[PDB]
Design a protein around this ligand. Structure first.
Ligand SMILES: [Zn+2]
Lengths: 95, 118
């Protein structure tokens, strides 16, 4: 099976920093009884104001982003990326 | 599975490995080599090799936590690599001499440039 992608509102211009912070958080909790259950975070080059979080359940996203200041306006609601649009998240175009 | 040392230490002078797409600062590639490729690339302790094997031109990042249980890692062809931060697309090409050496050792080189060009 395959997880879904969820959008999470993020302080504008802090998307890359926040994705990296969540990487550290995941590693920090990996040998605890409260591990992060998310699978990845994507911060595409030109996206502003949100990040994408990969997880099987929305609740896993909420649990991972709790306490993360840059994501506070994305804590109560995350929107699922429609399955047909999941590769557009990872699309890069060069003119 | 993941090591804190792998994570970019800051946002300045980030580079992406041309072989695996891992993103770290230049000083971290110098200090520790590439977490995935260094047995083959051997850039640890050699800034010149870092400049040859990594690129400052990349697009997007992915904090890859569970490469073994991710759709993203499959699309990006990083599912066999270590947890870490990876570029969505990397601009550049490994030098011909390194590609030839990789091939002689049983490592294929497929471009990490995923960009749709025009
Ligand atoms: Zn590498």
């Amino acid at each position: 099976m395959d997880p879904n992608l969820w959008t999470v509102k993020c302080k504008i211009g802090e998307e890359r920093a926040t994705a990296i912070s969540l990487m550290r958080k995941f590693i920090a909790y990996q040998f605890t009884d409260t591990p992060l259950q998310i699978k990845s975070v994507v911060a595409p080059e030109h996206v502003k104001g949100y990040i994408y979080v990969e997880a099987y359940k929305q609740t896993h996203v909420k649990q991972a982003i709790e306490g993360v200041g840059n994501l506070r306006l994305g804590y109560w609601n995350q929107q699922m990326v429609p399955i047909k649009e999941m590769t557009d998240v990872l699309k890069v175009v060069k003119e | 599975m993941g090591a804190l040392e792998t994570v970019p230490k800051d946002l300045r002078h980030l580079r992406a490995c041309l072989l695996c797409s891992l993103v770290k600062t230049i000083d971290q590639f110098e200090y520790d080599g590439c977490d995935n490729c260094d047995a083959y690339l051997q850039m640890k302790g050699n800034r010149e090799m870092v400049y040859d094997c990594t690129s400052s031109s990349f697009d997007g990042i992915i904090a890859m936590m569970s490469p073994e249980d991710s759709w993203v890692s499959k699309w990006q062809r990083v599912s066999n690599f270590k947890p870490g931060v990876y570029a969505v697309s990397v601009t550049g090409r490994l030098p011909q001499g390194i590609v030839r050496e990789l091939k002689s050792r049983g490592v294929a080189y497929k471009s990490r440039d995923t960009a749709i060009k025009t």
